[PDB]
């Protein structure tokens, strides 16, 4: 019982996000060992996305992704495949023909299916969960006007899952999305999910990205999302969990980056209290959740350091800039003691 994964077995798997640099650099070895000690599930940050894996939709770059999957099997990880079909980080050449004007519905369908057949096929039986479709719902309670939707309709989701289930029938198919605590967006998602599953579409689970803030959203809305998803027939997945502790709502300002010198004790405790309250709800509905994954291991590798404002110093994860366990981490351990 050494890592946080051992404390949370019999409940749900504790995962993290693995960067490409961690796999292709020998000086990032301590990070790899740190992940193997603490987590029992992994998710590729970028190496399995369309553009980084297949730039201009031409030649594949399996190298980075292969080292990821191999690392997972080397430690018996719950390997998650990140993004088969996403609206972002996808080459423009995909949504256009050989002219190239706007591609047709049938031709684009072939591109999506060929991509799935190749990507999911290469790691068939070696990947436990796939992020089939991601962020298909607009935050205003409607369909996202992506090229995927505007051309193939909304049924591109139904086809992506169907194709993936044919390619790798043992993989747990997942629909991922953010802002799932927003009722108007959550209702649209659950409704969409229920409609597809009724039509035979193999949707096994729905992923909550859980890009939460230090203040909100509340644990009540988080709980309601868990209940709504459970009643939808799918399994709950926490996919990209992180806690933004910086003032939000861009241009850099000395006042909106007030923790350059470090994170104060009252902030460390407010963050510890935050993570604790969230996991309290997770443990309450442990039978609904299959996996809880934090988007990164240490604070130095978070995307929130440079987004939405570049140059800031953020503390969203369980480990700090020096790979040391933060009070929030131990706070989560005490829950299972």
Residue numbers in the entry: 32 to 280, 292 to 379
Please share excerpts from the published article on this structure:
Xylanases (E.C. 3.2.1.8) are hemicellulases responsible for breaking down xylan, the major hemicellulosic component of plant cell walls, into short xylooligosaccharides by a general acid–base mechanism involving two glutamic acid residues. Typically, these enzymes can be classified into glycoside hydrolase (GH) families 10 and 11 based on amino-acid sequence similarities. Recently, these enzymes have received much attention owing to their use in degradation of lignocellulosic biomass for biofuels production.
The present study reports the development of a novel endoxylanase family GH10 derived from sugarcane soil metagenome (SCXyl). Along with a comprehensive functional and biophysical characterization, three dimensional structure resolution and SAXS studies of the protein in solution, we also described the potential biotechnological application of this enzyme for biomass to bioproducts application. To the best of our knowledge, this is the first report of a three-dimensional structure for a GH10 derived from a metagenomic library. Collectively, our findings bring relevant insights on enzymatic mechanisms for production of added-value products from plant biomass.
